Amino acid sequence: KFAETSEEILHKYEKFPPSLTFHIHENHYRFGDQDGVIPKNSSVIKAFLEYVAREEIPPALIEVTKDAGVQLYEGCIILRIYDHRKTYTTILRPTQLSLYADLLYQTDYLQVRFTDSLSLNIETEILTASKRNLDLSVPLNPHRATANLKPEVKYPYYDPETDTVVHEHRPDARGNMVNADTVD
Amino acid sequence: AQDLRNDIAMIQDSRAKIKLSAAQASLPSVCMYTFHNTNNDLTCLKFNDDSTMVASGFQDSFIKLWSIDGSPLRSLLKNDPKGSRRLVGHSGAVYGVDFSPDNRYLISCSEDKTVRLWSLDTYTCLVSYKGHSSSVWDVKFSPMGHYFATASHDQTARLWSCDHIYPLRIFAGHLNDVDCVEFHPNSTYLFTGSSDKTARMWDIARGECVRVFMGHSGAINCLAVSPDGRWLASAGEDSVVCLWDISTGRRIKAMRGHGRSSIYSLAFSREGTVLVSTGADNSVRVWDVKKNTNSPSAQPEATNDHMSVYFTKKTPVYTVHFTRRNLCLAGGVFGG
Amino acid sequence: KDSLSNPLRYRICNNCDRPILQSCLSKHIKHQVLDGVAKSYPLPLERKVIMPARSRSSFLRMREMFAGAILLYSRTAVIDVDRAGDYYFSVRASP
Amino acid sequence: SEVMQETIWDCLMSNILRQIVINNILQEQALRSSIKAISNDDQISLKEINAQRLKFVKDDKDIFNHINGKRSENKYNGTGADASNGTTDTEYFTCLNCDRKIAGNRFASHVDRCLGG
Amino acid sequence: SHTLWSPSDTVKDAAESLGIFNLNEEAAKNLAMDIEYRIHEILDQASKFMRHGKRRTLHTSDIDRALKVLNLEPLYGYDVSRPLVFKEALVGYVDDDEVDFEKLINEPLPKVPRFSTFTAHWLAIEGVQPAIPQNPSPNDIKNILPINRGSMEISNQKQGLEVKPLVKHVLSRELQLYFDKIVEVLLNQEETKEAELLRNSALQSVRADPGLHQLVPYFIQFISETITKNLKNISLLSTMLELIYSLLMNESLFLEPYVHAIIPCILTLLLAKKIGNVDDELQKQQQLALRELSASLLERVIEDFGSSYSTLKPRITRTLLRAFVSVNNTTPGTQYGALLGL
Amino acid sequence: VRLLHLIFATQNIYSYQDHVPLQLMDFAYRYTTGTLQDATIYSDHAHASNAGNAGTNAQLTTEDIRLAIAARTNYQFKPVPPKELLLELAAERNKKPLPAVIPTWGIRLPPEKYCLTGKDWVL
Amino acid sequence: AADLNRIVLEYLNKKGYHKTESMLRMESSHIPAPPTNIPTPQTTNISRPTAPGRPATIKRGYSILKSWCESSLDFYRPELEKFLYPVFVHCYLDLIARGYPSHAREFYDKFSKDHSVLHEYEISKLGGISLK
Amino acid sequence: YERLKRDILALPVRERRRIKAITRESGKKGMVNSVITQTRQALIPKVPVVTRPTNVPGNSVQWAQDVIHGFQALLASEIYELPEMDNLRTRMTGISREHGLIGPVDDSVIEIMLIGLEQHLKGIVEAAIDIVKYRRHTLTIEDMYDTLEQYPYLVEPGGTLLRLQSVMLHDED
């Protein structure tokens, strides 16, 4: 019953709203019960959208998300986007920075007698193993750990005329060429 | 393939009790290589693949290739006219060296945040590499070639290729220095071990840590992987070898021995039946590994899982290399 | 003498199951101080923390965005103008 | 003087060792003759000597099984109810003062109310 | 006070050497605190550099580098040679003075040591540790018991005396039965159509399979028993020649220790001094061929193990030529084998 | 100093060379000199120096020392493990794909003009 | 010890996509892997040098044939020398019909110099053919 | 050696001082030495809120609206130019309130700061120019990494150098 998959997390973990719904109507950006609105402010929401075009939850949701929802609201998220040109949804996941943030907001209380570097370290040895009971530990034979079948090669040869030759990959950038984009 | 099928059935009949079943333990042979006259100016050794050369990285930017069994070390050129080849091209001490499994190249890390590549048909550098902010301890190839990895004091590890000159991936999960790096036999995982008394695993594509193993009051220095994909070895200043299972994240066994000294190097068999530790208490220590594991091979007549210990003439030992065959091959220093 | 030298030596009566001590059977049938002190655990005065402006700025920005959106009200510290120079401070934790 | 002193110490040491070994061999010969199917001695609930090849009574490194190798309740597992596999919660004692089966974890509280009478 | 490094005099010495007077006590306590922490800091870094040089006796290069990595200024002027004194001095004690100075001219030349060259030997053949070459004797009983802990461990018919192969407990319960299956499938010798097909795959199994360095000498004694028990069966000697071609095509087997015990089988077979060998239309139609196969096997053996021994090819050449020229061969076939082996 | 050996005993390093204690004590002297020097400057700064405006009287509380040390560790003294910085930075690197190519059983080098060609250097 | 179980279970209680069912499976980080086997080259084929992000076996079989023979005894040379060429031309015909005519050409003129002392016109017989 | 060492340490009269240093020092409300709490406490914004036992002068109440405003600025490295006064002033008030001061920056600080800044950067680029050409060229990133390998005393480590070793991309990408 292993469930630490990517597409299966969306296919099976569906049909229930612990989510955060987004809202778009081609000019504003919104999620949840938001009194306000976000315009095309690339200082913020493009940092968000960069992550959400991938499947990573940003590092920063966690503490507000935790203090907001007491349960049934975490582990991961899915976001509810719907256009006005349909409705769409797609999944986001941790990155080990979200997980390290899951240790930070635990530090605003009991800073003393907490053995931080010990306890909050050993916590991860259990958590990381428990999140992931699906690893792929399976070998396969090379030509190097057996015998009688070592192959031949002809790149590092010795011409009679020239000294030796090698394998060296191929760009298109030449010398005395245009350096890069404009200065703006 | 009718007679072919009958002969395949005959091979299957050989499988019935004519083919060996267990391949139980087998106590090893050894051949030692003590390096005299160095004034302790010597960090690492490393042996070849087909067991013809042994390279030692000194502490003044020097790499002194040695030839076992003769002096054929001559270039293919017309110039460059005994069997010891010295490599320059470095600024600081050398801490790790590794060979190419096609065995016409060589890689060598240092404390001057360089990684460098050498040929072996001209004994000559080709490339320099720089993406690291601090000393690089150990550099190891992939089991297949093409990709190599490094460990540093910058509390991070970088996985390189050989064609591209700047790193491809950077791995960051250590609250102290990453002492050692190794690749699991599929070549899609890396095991870092550190002075923070913890060990970690990484997906080269992902970047981020699949598993973390904690124990071992003390540092870490060397790691090993058993060929079949269950088993990693943790060796550290604590002097207790720990065998770890990747899926469990909890050590299957805790081999106890080796007095009270740092354990510098270790290795498994060709078929995972046996391992070997190798230490600074002037002793090597063969351990059985299947005494209490999921394959309890016992074969009956301080703690157990300890077949034999071979002492040396006041020599701290630095490495091993199981050959294809039964025997080990060792490297130590200090003579008497 | 030597109370744990051997097990309790007794027999059991087959009539009433009582454990009987042998003598009762017939009647029932009828310098280093400084090493221990040297545990100083020294400390520094101040430590640096490598934290640029950009990382914490993006973090804090997105933080207060979500904080004003879902529910100052964010999770903040509290430092007094006096008796500062200490190293850890309390927190408001206002929801 | 050293050789004579080592000789005196060795006579003291060997006599003491022989006395301890005689006590051990006789006790264990008595236990084996008395109980031919000996798997465990009487022992106590408190752990004795650390487990060995002549460890009597079931010793669990994991701390979960008793001297007969059986589960007590060292696992707080379950389905949120009926958990423990039924340890003392699902046991009962017949009270002779009122003729009722009483849950064993409630015998003390039952006694105070029952013996009142 | 708080910790080590008593700030009543140490920090006082520092400040009063600077030229101040007013350092409150608690300040100097805290200062002792800081400098002690910096000490532990640099010390751990130089340890990190220590255990890469895989040494223990921390030298000054360790701390010098450990400074260079902390973005901290270096420290010059501390040479290993010309050792230290810490001479005393008293005032109405301080225990400090250095009286190693007053030089005017130096004209000494340093002497170069040998280069770093390596000394191989042999150690631990098959579990047993020789003491004859450069090794220890049992003198680690005198070592300090926390350190170096734990300790478990006549003729050309020799295969090993310090290994103790007599006790039959080492092999296994499994391995005796495996060996029985092997020998029984070998010594079958019933038909000419299926028996070779029934045994050849076990032959080609021991050709290539792992962990066989436990049961080698049992195998050796068994096959030597086979040759000394019987001389007539072309079948058994053919199978044994092919078996030795098998054991030598293996890749997971080390066979230095036993060449000087397998040579006699090949030679006593290749000569093949037959007391009988009656005329049977196959006394020589293949006996020559069997001798030829053994000779080629011999060529292989000498070509392989001609580096770990020098006396072998010598001994082999001497044996065969002594058996060659003797007119009392009593048969041409032995001399033919000698000729085709030479 | 014997107490320096006593401090060595805390880390299981009883293999010194006897130059280390001289050297580390010299170091700490240098360090604390600089420290309580610039702290004295700051104690002057609170005492409002220029080319004659007031006197210079020393107290040297702990706050000044704290100031004089935080400036040093502003550019020295390997700080707490900056994990979060590295995590985000490495996620920025750990973002663009692998090459996903096959050099077909050899080594693939950088192109010449990025390779070195370690010839005898010459003018 | 048990405090770690307490705290991680409270954590997983707060993680809304970790219910009580699968949190206990999360506590099954104490069952290890089964004893598995090493991939001998009996059944499992080789893999190619690639990336970690997801023909010519004929050539390697012929390489086996030319390696295992020459590494054999001297008695067996005069008979396997004639076992070489026919299977070579057979496997060349097999691959050039399989659909890799370029590969066929390359390992042909690579291994055309196999039996040049016996066969003289056959190299011209098979050199004037490229396409299926 | 250890026993003899302790005995010789007792030979000094400081055996008494050595005997007293058994407790745990920093007799305060605390000095934590962990990592994560240093980080967090060095990450959240602080707030200089004040007491008032009898009178805490200043005549200007403390605010943390200023800290939010400071962290919200379009700081450098997004824009392509060094910041003009106003941005820098808005960022400073934030830092001063966030450290535990009060009172407004007084419009001369910003200018001296800009001055020191442009001096800094002229020094750096002069260094790189001294690298590339000895006596029509155009400069790259690698030359600046070279000169920040040679001269690292210029820049304070942290933040940017690590970021500098994560921008050196290869040609095709």
Side-chain angles (χ1 to χ4, degrees), chain A residues 135-147:
Chain A
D135 302 342
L136 308 169
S137 47
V138 291
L140 202 145
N141 73 306
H143 300 252
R144 264 61 168 272
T146 195

Side-chain angles (χ1 to χ4, degrees), chain C residues 12-47:
Chain C
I12 295 174
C13 183
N14 293 330
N15 297 329
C16 62
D17 307 311
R18 188 178 179 177
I20 293 177
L21 294 174
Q22 182 69 54
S23 56
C24 299
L25 185 60
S26 177
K27 294 181 180 177
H28 181 85
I29 292 171
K30 293 182 181 182
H31 42 100
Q32 197 266 300
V33 61
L34 302 198
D35 173 280
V37 161
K39 293 302 312 312
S40 55
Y41 189 73
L43 279 301
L45 266 288
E46 319 303 306
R47 292 189 103 97

Side-chain angles (χ1 to χ4, degrees), chain B residues 16-17 19-21 23-38 42-44 58-59 64 66-67 93 95 111 134-135 137 153 176-177 179 195 219-221 237 258-261 264 271 280-281 285 299-302 306-313 318 324-327, chain E residues 45 48-49 51-57 59 61-62 65 68-69 113-129 134-136 140 146-153 169-175 178 181-182 185 197 201-202 204-206 208-214 251-254 307:
Chain B
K17 314 155 287 180
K19 296 286 181 192
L20 164 56
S21 53
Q24 65 192 320
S26 311
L27 208 62
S29 303
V30 173
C31 197
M32 202 79 170
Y33 288 115
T34 76
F35 278 98
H36 284 106
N37 314 134
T38 64
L42 195 142
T43 69
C44 67
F58 280 69
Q59 208 164 15
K64 181 70 82 74
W66 276 285
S67 58
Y95 293 107
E111 94 180 11
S134 276
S135 317
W137 310 123
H153 193 41
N176 214 18
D177 73 308
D179 291 282
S195 182
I220 312 289
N221 203 332
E237 324 300 300
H258 210 267
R260 314 195 65 176
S261 296
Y264 293 153
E271 316 304 306
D281 65 345
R285 279 199 201 286
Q299 321 311 327
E301 60 93 30
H306 190 300
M307 295 199 165
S308 177
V309 41
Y310 311 117
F311 284 97
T312 69
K313 183 73 81 69
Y318 282 3
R324 200 70 47 68
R325 304 167 291 176
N326 179 22
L327 82 170
Chain E
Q45 285 292 334
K48 301 192 204 316
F49 299 165
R51 66 198 178 77
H52 280 287
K54 309 190 169 61
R55 49 165 150 69
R56 296 191 195 169
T57 172
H59 286 54
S61 298
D62 310 327
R65 298 184 157 84
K68 204 205 302 315
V69 54
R114 276 295 100 196
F115 306 117
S116 67
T117 45
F118 68 97
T119 291
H121 57 65
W122 192 271
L123 184 147
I125 285 166
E126 183 51 24
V128 71
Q129 207 194 15
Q134 296 92 75
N135 292 67
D140 296 332
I147 315 189
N148 311 333
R149 272 197 81 230
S151 299
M152 173 62 202
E153 289 266 16
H169 289 51
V170 299
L171 43 96
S172 70
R173 185 160 286 98
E174 162 52 29
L175 188 144
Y178 180 55
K181 164 56 71 159
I182 287 288
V185 170
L197 198 147
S201 190
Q204 300 285 325
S205 165
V206 68
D209 46 351
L212 285 165
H213 212 308
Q214 198 100 342
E251 287 78 359
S252 168
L253 261 177
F254 194 33
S307 297

Side-chain angles (χ1 to χ4, degrees), chain H residues 116-127:
Chain H
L117 203 149
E118 56 202 317
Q119 303 262 323
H120 194 43
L121 276 288
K122 285 156 173 149
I124 284 168
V125 179
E126 279 179 355

Side-chain angles (χ1 to χ4, degrees), chain C residues 24-82:
Chain C
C24 299
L25 185 60
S26 177
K27 294 181 180 177
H28 181 85
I29 292 171
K30 293 182 181 182
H31 42 100
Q32 197 266 300
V33 61
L34 302 198
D35 173 280
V37 161
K39 293 302 312 312
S40 55
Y41 189 73
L43 279 301
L45 266 288
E46 319 303 306
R47 292 189 103 97
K48 191 173 182 63
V49 181
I50 312 191
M51 182 58 84
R54 187 169 56 266
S55 169
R56 93 201 288 291
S57 294
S58 68
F59 177 35
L60 291 159
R61 200 172 289 109
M62 183 65 78
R63 145 176 289 180
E64 66 88 16
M65 189 261 256
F66 270 54
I70 294 299
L71 288 78
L72 68 160
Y73 54 86
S74 162
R75 183 66 62 82
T76 62
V78 168
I79 184 171
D80 202 313
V81 311
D82 73 82

Side-chain angles (χ1 to χ4, degrees), chain B residues 9 25 39 47 49 59-60 64 79 86 106 115 149 161 203 218 234 239 264 281 289 297 307 309 311-312 324:
Chain B
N39 82 98
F47 288 94
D49 299 325
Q59 208 164 15
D60 47 332
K64 181 70 82 74
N79 62 343
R86 197 206 71 182
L106 174 58
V115 172
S161 178
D203 181 2
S234 83
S239 90
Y264 293 153
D281 65 345
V289 312
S297 290
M307 295 199 165
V309 41
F311 284 97
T312 69
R324 200 70 47 68

